Design a binder for this molecule. Structure first.
Ligand code: CA
Length: 525
């Protein structure tokens, strides 16, 4: 009996946000899956959305698969470079393409971020039914600003661009809210399925990505919950992570780094607005979980859930960016929002608000890790993940076994009984996976899918990392870092605090040789 797959991806959700990962946010559906399943604490993505998604659906690195950098960041200089096409390219075959030609029904509702053009949509790349937001973000209610010369580039790049199969949509339905619409559509496609054949269901939410927006009735459940601020929260999260066994009691958390004012330096009005942004975030996460519950509860009542491999993950670390801090996102983002949105306290969270919660709230959720989204430190690339599938032996536990998002395609092919086609598919050259199937590990035959000699690289925006076993070197250029390689023993120092470059040069030099091979093999520019 071939299993079904349900692959759920949160957008910018933090490590300790979910209850079963140490958080205060109501996530009852995900908690039940997590505690019955396997919770992963050493599972990694890339540091932002589209790199990670290209890896998820191929089993190889984003510099091969077409998102060598984010499409939104491409330059004339990068044009023509293999794997910097700005969309999922044809140097790869996608997981749904392989499963569909083997009898699986491929169903998707959510954010794509792997191409905007017709030949790059889910319908072109293996999904028989799909309801999708093509860009990397959008207003969750479909409220659009005017688009003219004056519009900030970050808003120009995030329109509410939706497609259903081949149909680029003209209007969005009344009551549109991104998470609810994705739950509604995937539920529709499941109810309409051929019940005599398995499905591959992909549920990439755009929540809890900015702009932070959620139903007022849910935000109201969190009124006052965050009045003590993001460092009080970080302390609550760290304590809970340790109580639950997700982090060891002796772990030294990375200090919090922000150019903004600390909570106690803020004025009452400023704190109230920041706390409300976190209340709205919490509601986004709760409402995402509610929609997950609708899908999972349907499958449960169908008697399909126990034969469904359920994977939940976030796509990168929590979002600590200050969007106002980047001229590339402008011009004049704050002024534009002042003149076109209403970010006053009582409107934060509504369709015509536009807020993001900033670096201190983000680092509460990445703690004890260093930094957050778009960095190659663990705060950017270690994300929460769970697997619920009762056939497998390793269930009910917390695992600190090393894993990455590139392992997912090989694992699901393995479970599906489908071989990766090798180096050719549909008359073209394609890449072979760099990840490894989890089935030996999850069946109890081995302790992990990787070992102390496994080598994994990362690069984005000029930031780098290279890992072998539990040794990891990081390169952060100015003014994000010292502009030289730093070396961490993640087994002793998960916070990437103690730079061993000077005391262990032999190890660093080994990892630099691995970095150079990673560059060569994947086409890093
Ligand atoms: Ca993301």
């Amino acid at each position: 009996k071939r299993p079904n797959f349900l692959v759920i991806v949160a957008d910018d959700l933090g490590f300790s946000d979910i209850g079963a990962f140490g958080g205060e946010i109501a996530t009852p559906n995900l908690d039940a899956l997590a505690i019955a399943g396997l919770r992963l604490t050493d599972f990694h993505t890339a540091s932002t959305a589209s790199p990670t998604r290209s890896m998820l659906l191929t089993g190889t690195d984003h510099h091969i698969a077409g998102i060598g950098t984010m499409a939104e960041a491409l330059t004339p200089e990068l044009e023509g470079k293999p794997g910097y096409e700005g969309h999922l390219n044809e140097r790869v075959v996608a997981l749904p393409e392989l499963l569909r030609e083997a009898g699986y029904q491929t169903l998707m509702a959510g954010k794509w971020h792997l191409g905007l053009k017709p030949e790059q949509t889910p319908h072109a790349r293996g999904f028989e039914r799909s309801f999708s937001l093509l860009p990397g973000a959008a207003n969750h209610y479909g409220f659009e600003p005017p688009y003219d010369e004056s519009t900030p580039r970050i808003l120009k790049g995030t329109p509410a661009l939706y497609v259903e199969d081949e149909r680029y949509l003209d209007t969005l339905p009344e009551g549109f809210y991104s998470s609810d619409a994705f739950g509604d559509k995937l539920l529709q496609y499941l109810k309409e399925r051929d019940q005599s054949r398995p499905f591959f269901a992909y549920l990439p939410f755009s929540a809890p990505h900015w702009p932070l927006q959620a139903p007022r009735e849910i935000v109201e459940k969190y009124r006052g919950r965050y009045d003590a601020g993001p460092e009080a929260l970080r302390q609550e999260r760290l304590a809970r992570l340790k109580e639950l066994g997700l982090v060891e009691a002796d772990v030294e958390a990375h200090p919090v780094l922000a150019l903004t004012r600390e909570w106690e330096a803020l004025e009452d009005e400023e704190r109230a607005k920041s706390a409300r942004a976190m209340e709205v975030y919490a509601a986004m996460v709760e409402r995402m979980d509610w929609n997950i519950g609708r899908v999972v509860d349907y499958l449960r009542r169908q008697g399909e859930l126990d034969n469904t491999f359920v994977l939940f993950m976030s796509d990168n670390g929590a979002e600590g960016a200050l969007l106002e801090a980047f001229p590339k996102f402008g011009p004049d983002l704050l002024g534009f929002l002042d003149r076109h949105y209403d970010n006053s306290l009582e409107n934060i969270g509504r369709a015509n608000s536009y807020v993001w919660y900033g670096p201190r709230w983000a680092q509460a959720a990445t703690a004890p890790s260093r930094l957050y989204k778009a960095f190659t430190t663990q705060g950017g690339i270690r994300v929460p993940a769970l697997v619920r599938y009762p056939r497998l032996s390793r269930q009910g536990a917390i695992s600190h076994a090393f894993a990455t998002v590139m392992d997912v395609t090989p694992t699901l092919l393995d479970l599906a009984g489908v071989r990766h086609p090798g180096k050719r598919w549909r008359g073209r050259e394609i890449a072979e996976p760099r990840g490894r199937s989890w089935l030996g590990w999850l069946s109890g035959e081995t302790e992990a899918a990787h070992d102390e000699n496994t080598v994994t690289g990362w690069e984005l925006f000029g930031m780098r990392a290279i890992r072998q076993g539990d040794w990891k070197a990081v390169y952060l250029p100015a003014p994000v870092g010292p502009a030289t390689w730093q070396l961490y023993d993640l087994a002793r120092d998960p916070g990437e605090i103690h730079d061993l470059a000077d005391s262990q040069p032999g190890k660093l030099a080994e990892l630099i040789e691995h970095w150079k091979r990673y560059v060569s093999e994947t086409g890093v520019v």
